[PDB]
Design a protein around this ligand. Structure first.
Ligand SMILES: [Zn+2]
Lengths: 615, 558, 107
């Protein structure tokens, strides 16, 4: 409690040795190494038992250390001359804190992500003499753990050495079961993309070795079961984050063999009754996540062949499945969903209470723990269980714009909904009335809705298309090769003449008297929305003769020479959209207007997008 | 006295690993097919080889083939231990695939399922398979592909008088597409199980014959004048990755490099360049368009394959509909070719972009590897990794800024990872390999190198982000998809994302913000600003003169 | 069996049953035109992972018994699968006589 101000002054002391200006990395060894005395002062203030258990003064400590290593990438490769660089000294010391914090998932994920910053985003500077002096260090310290794991067969091992041997193996395998974004090509066995690495077969070998150890040992310690659940936690984390992770569907897998391995491993884990511990959600999490990846997709047979569940059934007891009430509850839910999707449609009926489909129950109960409702507040379990129960409903499928209107005006589709005029009038009454000045975020959400709703207006006379089956635009979201402005239509309908959403847009955003200060973000949002409108509709005449820049080309003047580069290169993307029309540009006068506009920027920081704006 | 030690189990059931391998063969089923692979091979006969026999693997004329496979599997379970059971199966199924293949009249329907079954045999226990079996199987799959000479050699454009009056059959084309795809996938599988062996034994695999055969089949896969099959391009560059990865991580690195001629590399790297300069556009992935510029993943070969699930598996329903399933036949069940294709979702195009972006990450990843193999200068680390990689960097920044920002596709991030990766393929090329970066080849890209570095150094101004309040209003514009991703990850699939302790989501409103910076093409990571700075500013070569440099600095401020 | 050319499972792969339109007792699904021995070997592979030996035995005993039963009590259907299923059941019984629990023997 007294050493929060010490770290709060120490982060300022680290940032004080930045530079004279805002640019500071300093990759080389400067001729001045006093902060290494602070570096030793960081990690030696980390392994302790009294108030290291406080969350904030540990997190600020490791964030201070990552801010030291981020702005000083020379510290890792400073050649602490035993035989190596001191990043090898950093790995095992950093491993000791993580192996002292094995049970708290926050304290090890938050450590390993910044270890990923320290190896990926910092040993890109050095390469060949330094990539192979840490990718071998992991192989040596993992060879050491798998080597010391096998002497527990021959009985001459200890009992506490067994514990931290398994926990250190757990942390080394946990660092590498992340996504590809954490450890990039920094470590040489994680090099290959495409979900298929050198670590995959080595990892499956190590999990088979640790299952062989669990078969070879015989011990009923309670915390041994606690650390024995961590390996199935690790093996379900191994396969759930190699998924492609699409928009809102269940994240599809990349390799069927990894799914087969994880299902076979945790099924062998359950057969030998390993890791039965009271009120522990870990196995239930693994079972529900792996079933959520295999709901009705191409791997469902792969779920039912390699994770059989029908031979633990035991209908005649309130103790329904044998293991533990969380694990038995999750497996009962899985069995309920498999039995539901097995039976025909005429055999199922709707509940009207839990909004789930259900079969003719039993002569017994057998339906309690599946929808009881759910357990102690293990916050992910009940939403997993809701997804497993509610993916069968075959309702209105989730859509991106339907999400962003339900994220914005919640509870909207208790009505007709897919009628297109009522959502326009609801957007109208929200865009005219319900703001005084405060929606500096909600209006940006409104203008991304007004951008995406313009396409859905454009898909009539494109009579069949609908609000639900519009995932993305066919013109503004997907793109093809060649000249990209050939796809937009010269004789598309005019934005002022027919598109009601540009009437809304000019009624609020372009006729407001304070366009010169909304914010940078709302200007970017109005430029994206006006980009989508003028890519689906003809823009109005930029000049009639009475001066009269038409309140949107004025925004192109306001943003094209603006201070930030983002509004500049965003506003340059609609300059070609003014250049394409007919009965406004058939005798090439908007072209001449844009030409004599682009000849009028002798300002240096506009010299970038101008070259884009010409081309 | 020492009541501490962990006690053993007196009834350790070491599982019979050959029985588990038997069961993994017997219920091997490719994704999308209705029947198991052995259960498909029970429905296949071969009526032109009157009697097949190699080493007591007798197949009669009208007999089911899978009967003979399961007879071999049961007969060799009692006899052999696992490493002998593997290569017994490998050579027997290889001889069967061979004499089904080299025959003038006989249909080859058993061949895809036997290759996929062979792949199931290989990758079961990679520690168990002795690598001479891997050498024999690799040589057999390479000359098996040179038997199937004509799948990867269809011409670019046909005759104008190519009348499409024809039975329009797809079943034979589906067979040999499955043969080629499963064959290249088996090449990838052989090399990763050879990659998983202890690192002193790679010389038992490689000789001259391995590399000449893969040189031929690699020229065959990454085509120039024929229609590319993208399914084999993935595996044919992943094999080159496995090669360049084990050259790094072995001890006797010279006897691989002495075994490799430089002509192998300068035939490989030009095809990798020509792959790298192709385009990825979701609106015409699955369209058939102009050759060798868009990686297109044709409609008529769209299925998963063995290692990775690469498409939407539209041709997986036709694998089960290739046999009659109540009959013992040799010719295929007829699949009409023009029935497929029915239009509901362009999301399939987005995930195929995701795979093709990982393919380009793979190509410049093996560039990054074989920089580190040939750290000294050679024929092949030779300055065109400035030209092609700087062309790639400059265009994937330029049409990022012109076209992709605000397009709410999931593939923005990886597409702005590639540029973020390939700068490093610039950087250590610039810093550690300047001695071959010749004076003419740097001036071949003086436009594009300096412009690409300048689009990183423009981000040191940073009047855009500067806070928290409006940056989340930017990620409601460009990065709503990753918000959906992290909410579905937080509520379902991550152990640490519940009861968030007010330091794990301050990390989230750090890293989502730096992510949406890296997407918005303003404020990249500071390390890449330094790496782009110390190529432009540093005096290894006069890219700019000092009166030309400050003409670039005035277009940021400075 | 002694004198037959094919194995018993290999005979049951060559048998269909075209009057029971769909056989199912306890996840032992047999389609109409499907080979019967396909379903036997699917049960054998599926119940190998799950059951230990004394449960694998009486699972096979009651499943093959129900199959022999509804092939038998039927007016039109041929009973060609019945001898081979009875002989297969005998192979199931006398493999490890110490393993087979005697309520299965009673049934
Ligand atoms: Zn649109």
């Amino acid at each position: 409690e007294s050493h929060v101000k010490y770290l709060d002054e120490l982060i300022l002391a680290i940032k004080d040795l930045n530079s004279g200006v805002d640019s500071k990395v300093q990759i080389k060894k400067v001729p001045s190494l006093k902060i290494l005395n602070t570096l030793i002062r960081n990690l030696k203030d980390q392994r302790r038992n009294n108030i290291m258990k406080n969350d904030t003064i540990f997190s600020k400590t490791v964030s201070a250390l990552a801010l030291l290593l981020e702005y000083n990438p020379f510290l890792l490769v400073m050649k602490d001359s035993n035989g190596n660089f001191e990043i090898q000294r950093l790995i095992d010391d950093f491993l000791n804190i993580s192996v002292l914090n094995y049970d708290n998932y926050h304290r090890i994920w938050f450590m390993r992500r910044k270890l990923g910053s320290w190896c990926k985003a910092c040993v890109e500077f050095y390469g060949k003499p330094a990539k192979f002096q840490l990718t071998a260090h992991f192989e040596n310290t993992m060879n050491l753990y798998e080597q010391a794991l096998t002497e527990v067969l021959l009985g001459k091992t200890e009992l506490l050495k067994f514990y931290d041997t398994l926990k250190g193996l757990y942390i080394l395998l946990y660092w590498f079961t992340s996504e590809y974004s954490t450890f990039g090509n920094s470590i040489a066995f994680l090099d290959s993309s495409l979900g298929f690495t050198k670590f995959d077969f080595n990892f499956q070998r190590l999990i088979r070795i640790v299952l062989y150890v669990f078969d070879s040992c015989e011990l009923a310690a309670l915390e041994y079961a606690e650390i024995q659940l961590k390996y199935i936690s690790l093996v379900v984390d191994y396969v759930c984050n190699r998924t492609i992770s699409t928009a809102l569907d269940a994240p599809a897998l990349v390799c069927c063999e990894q799914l087969k391995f994880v299902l076979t491993t945790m099924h062998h884990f359950l057969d030998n009754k390993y890791g039965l511990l009271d009120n522990d959600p870990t196995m239930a999490k693994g079972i529900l996540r792996l079933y959520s990846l295999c709901i009705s997709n191409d791997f469902s047979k792969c779920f039912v062949d390699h994770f059989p569940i029908d031979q633990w059934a035991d209908f005649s007891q309130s103790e329904h499945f044998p293991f533990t009430q969380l694990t038995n509850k999750a497996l009962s839910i899985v069995y309920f969903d498999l039995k539901r999707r097995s039976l025909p449609v005429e055999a199922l009926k709707y509940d009207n209470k839990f909004n789930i489909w259900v079969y003719q129950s039993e002569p017994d109960s057998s339906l309690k723990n599946v929808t009881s409702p759910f357990d102690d507040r293990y916050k992910q379990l009940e939403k997993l269980r809701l997804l497993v129960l509610k993916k069968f409903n075959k309702t209105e499928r989730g859509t991106l714009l339907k999400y962003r209107v339900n994220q914005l005006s919640p509870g909207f589709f208790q009505r007709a909904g897919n009628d297109f005029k009522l959502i326009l009038n609801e957007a109208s009454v929200s865009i005219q009335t319900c703001f005084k000045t405060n929606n500096i975020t909600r209006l940006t959400s409104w203008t991304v809705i007004l951008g995406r709703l313009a396409c859905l207006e454009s898909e009539k006379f494109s009579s069949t298309k609908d609000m639900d089956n519009w995932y993305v635009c066919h013109l503004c979201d997907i793109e093809k090769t060649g000249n990209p402005f050939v796809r937009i239509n010269p004789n598309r309908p005019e934005a002022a003449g027919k598109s009601e959403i540009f009437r809304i847009l000019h009624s609020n955003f372009l006729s407001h008297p304070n366009i010169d200060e909304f914010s940078e973000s709302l200007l970017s949002g109005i430029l994206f929305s006006l980009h989508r409108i003028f890519s689906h509709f003809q823009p109005p005449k930029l000049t009639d003769g009475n001066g009269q820049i038409n309140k949107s080309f004025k925004l192109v003047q306001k943003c094209f020479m603006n201070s930030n580069r983002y509004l500049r290169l965003l506003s340059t993307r609609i300059i070609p959209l003014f250049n394409i029309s007919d009965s406004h540009n058939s005798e090439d006068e908007h072209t001449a207007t844009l030409i004599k506009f682009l000849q009028s920027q002798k300002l240096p920081v506009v010299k970038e997008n101008l070259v884009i704006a010409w081309t | 006295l020492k009541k501490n030690m962990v006690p053993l189990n007196p009834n350790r059931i070491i599982p019979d690993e050959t029985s588990l391998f038997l069961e993994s063969i017997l219920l091997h089923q490719i994704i999308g097919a209705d029947l198991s692979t052995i259960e498909i091979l029970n429905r296949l006969k071969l009526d032109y080889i009157t009697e097949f026999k190699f080493k007591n693997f007798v197949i009669a004329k009208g007999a089911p083939i899978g009967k003979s496979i399961v007879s071999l599997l049961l007969r060799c379970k009692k006899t052999l231990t696992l490493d002998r059971f593997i290569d017994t199966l490998l050579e027997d199924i290889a001889v069967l695939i061979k004499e089904i293949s080299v025959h003038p009249n006989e249909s080859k329907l058993a061949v895809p399922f036997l290759v996929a079954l062979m792949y199931q045999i290989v990758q079961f226990r990679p520690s168990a398979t002795h690598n001479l079996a891997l050498k024999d199987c690799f040589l057999f799959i390479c000359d098996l592909i040179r038997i199937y000479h004509h799948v990867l050699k269809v011409p670019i454009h046909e005759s104008n008088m190519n009348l499409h009056v024809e039975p329009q059959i797809f079943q034979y084309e589906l067979i040999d597409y499955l043969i080629i795809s499963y064959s290249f996938d088996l090449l990838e599988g052989i090399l990763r199980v050879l990659q998983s062996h202890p690192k002193q034994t790679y010389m038992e695999f490689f000789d001259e014959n391995i590399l000449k055969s893969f040189e031929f089949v690699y020229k065959l896969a990454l085509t120039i004048s024929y229609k590319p099959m993208v399914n084999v391009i993935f595996s044919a560059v992943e094999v080159v990755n496995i090669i360049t990865s084990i050259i790094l991580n072995m001890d006797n690195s010279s006897d691989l490099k002495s075994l490799i001629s430089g002509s192998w590399w300068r035939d490989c790297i030009t095809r990798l360049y020509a792959l790298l300069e192709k385009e990825i556009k979701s609106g015409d992935v699955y369209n058939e368009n102009v050759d060798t510029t868009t990686l297109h993943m044709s409609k008529y070969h769209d299925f998963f394959g063995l290692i990775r699930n690469i498409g939407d598996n539209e041709l997986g329903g036709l694998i089960s509909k290739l046999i009659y399933t109540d009959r013992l036949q040799s010719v295929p069940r007829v699949i009409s070719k023009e029935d497929i294709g029915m239009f509901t979702a362009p999301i399939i195009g987005y995930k195929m972009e995701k795979w093709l972006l990982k393919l380009k990450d793979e190509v410049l990843n093996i560039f990054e590897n074989l920089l580190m193999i040939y750290g000294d200068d050679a024929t092949i680390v030779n300055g065109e990794m400035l030209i092609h990689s700087s062309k790639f960097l400059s265009r994937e920044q330029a049409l990022m800024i012109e076209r992709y920002v605000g397009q709410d596709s999931p593939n923005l991030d990886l597409r702005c990872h590639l540029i973020e990766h390939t700068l490093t393929i610039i950087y250590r090329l610039w810093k550690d390999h300047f001695k071959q970066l010749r004076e003419e080849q740097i001036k071949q890209v003086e436009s594009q190198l300096i412009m690409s570095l300048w689009r990183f150094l423009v981000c040191q101004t940073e009047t855009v982000t500067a806070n928290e309040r409006e940056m989340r209003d930017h990620r409601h514009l460009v990065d709503s998809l990753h918000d959906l991703t992290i909410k579905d990850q937080a509520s379902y699939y991550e152990d640490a994302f519940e009861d968030l302790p007010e330091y794990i989501e301050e990390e989230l409103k750090m890293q989502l913000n730096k992510r949406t910076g890296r997407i918005m093409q303003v404020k990249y990571d500071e390390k890449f600003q330094e790496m782009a700075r110390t190529i432009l500013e540093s005096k290894s070569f006069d890219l700019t003169t000092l009166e030309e440099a400050d003409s670039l600095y005035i277009s940021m401020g400075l």
